[PDB]
Amino acid sequence: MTREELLRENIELAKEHIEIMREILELLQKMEELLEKARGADEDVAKTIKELLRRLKEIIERNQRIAKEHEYIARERS
Amino acid sequence: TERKLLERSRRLQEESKRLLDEMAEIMRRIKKLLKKARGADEKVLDELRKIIERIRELLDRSRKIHERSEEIAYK
């Protein structure tokens, strides 16, 4: 390779490296989009489960109110 | 009286049954939400995994470019 050819290759290599860094920059942003998507998805799921567990807890407390009343009734009917 | 208390108890069993059925559906819905969330996270991690292997392949070429640049500087 001639000197002028080697320097031109140096230039091409630099330009190629910049395009490569750009593609990585693109891919990093796509990673952030995916990480935040899953982040929000797990937070919506967590919210739904949090309220479902709250509904569930109040149903249980009411259940034990009924059960203790049953017991009070069975005692009375004796 | 026996008849009043027995209808009191009978009315409560109707309430309990509706509550127990409601609890059951909630647990099945919770179980499904977790399975769906796991599937969605596995999907994201699948895609993240592929993005990273592209990045690392881009760093293979980056190292090749650097390696070639040092060659040119040597002589």
SSE arrangement:
The complex is a heterodimer of chains A (78) and B (75).
Chain A: H1 3-76
Chain B: H1 2-74
Give the tally of structural domains of chain A: 1
Q: Note the gap between the termini of chain A.
A: 109 Å
User: What portion of residues of chain A belong to β-strands?
Assistant: under 5%
Helix content of chain B: over 70%
Written account of the structure:
The complex is a heterodimer of chains A (78) and B (75). Chain A is mostly helical. Chain A has one helix at 3-76. Chain A has one domain (2-78). Helices cover 95% and strands 0% of the residues of chain A. Chain A is rod-shaped. Chain B is rod-shaped and about 110 Å long. Chain B is 97% helix and 0% strand. The longest helix of chain B has 73 residues, at 2-74. In chain B, 0% of the residues are buried. Chain B is built from one helix and no strands. The interface between A and B is large, with 39 and 39 residues.
